[PDB]
Amino acid sequence: LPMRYRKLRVFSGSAVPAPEEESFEVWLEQATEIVKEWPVTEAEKKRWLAESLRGPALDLMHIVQADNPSISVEECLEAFKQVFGSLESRRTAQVRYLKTYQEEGEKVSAYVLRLETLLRRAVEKRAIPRRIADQVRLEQVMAGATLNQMLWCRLRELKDQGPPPSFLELMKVIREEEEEEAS
Template identity: 50%
Template sequence: MAMTLLEDWCKGMDVNSQRALLVWGIPVNCDEAEIKETLQAAMPQVPYRVLGRMFWREENAKAALLELTGAVDYTAIPREMPGKGGVWKVVFKPPTSDAEFLERLHLFLAREGWTVQDVARVLGFQNPTPAPIPDMRAEMLNYILHNVIPPLVESIGYRKLTLFSGRDILGPGEETFDPWLEHTNEVIKEWQVSDVEKRRRLMESLRGPAADVIRIFKTSNPAITTAKCLKALEQAFGSVESFRDAQVRFLNTYQKPGEKVSAYVIRLEPLLKKVVEKGAIDKDNVNRARLEQVIVGANHSGALQRLWLTAVAEGPTPNLFQLLVQIREGEAEEEEAEAVLLQLGLKGPL
């Protein structure tokens, strides 16, 4: 509904909907001065002008339409802001990849006191014969070409993070912390961009209290790294499970009836990772701890699997991949043997 209102309002005022914000949830008794003060406090770095206000009957509250008047860092636009009567919500259309590229390029140039025309002139696009480039501008151009353009290009079509807010009641598309953190760590490893760009993308995935936590940390430390942002979120929203609790949970996790040993090993791995993170198991002993728990926790049905586990226990300790390969080979051999028995009319375990 809010997005539809934004688009319809923009059409009625001949405004580009991708250059507009809709702020709603404003109490009816909130006057113009209070609205202005709230917007300035929540978006000090965002250039805008208020185009109009209206009463939104379905929400029994006011809504305001804002037009962006300059280059904007969209990560600086909050989805929610504290205001009179509670939380005011902000809706805007995420820019397309091309629009985002140009927006961020304009933003960078504005910060450096340059314009797109300056870059074109330096590159010689406005003169038949390119003029000699002053040393300072040549250095600036080199910086743009090597440090600004590549990250902008790489950011188009990148794999985005899922949403996390830290609220007890999840909103559309949001996840609880542990699955979100696991997915985030996996995706961040894929991004071949600077840490500043990683932090910007991380902020895109945060809402509500989670976004507030990082904003507070950035206020005291503007250069905070992505790793420290994730650590701060883990301290604020992560599990408070002690290292002893994590260890007990790991040691008391067994193979379920009907579950393959390979599936059991995969299910065991996040618990082992948590135990290592808590310091209950040294990183150098991870492979041995995994193998010992598999030997203890697996239902060793079948003579072939028992023989296989004994051989593994006596040989070099395999890593996770090696262990899974050996287990899958053992399972395949046992399935093949069982198929032969079924063909012969014999039933029952080996």
């Protein structure tokens, strides 16, 4: 049998959130689900929507409704996106990707996962053409990582051995090299 009901994800909109809160992009997934999918009455949608909000973000929702009583939940979410959503230039998406380097004590397979989230944003905002993202991924790994020289021998084969690797192919080759023998 399906286990315990799952708690709502949550969001404050604060300049420094609590470590249990989500990104706006993820709270907006839960909110889009509640709006589009749930078989529920409007005031019960609105009480489930309201129950997820904290911080400053809870405080906007009342102001917007009082000034327009005809507001649907589909319209109220459009006001919520303007105040708490995100604005970022093409140049900022591009510069924020290319500046990313491996940290102290971070593993190479941890770095290559962290770096892949930034490459998707830069391809959405048309900063990088989708035609060349697999070449741009390999060039940035060899630029930013602290590769051991047996790993260096393999990545230099992938650079030359036909087309550039996919994400899961590159991630496999890295994992085979990360393992150490005990003493």
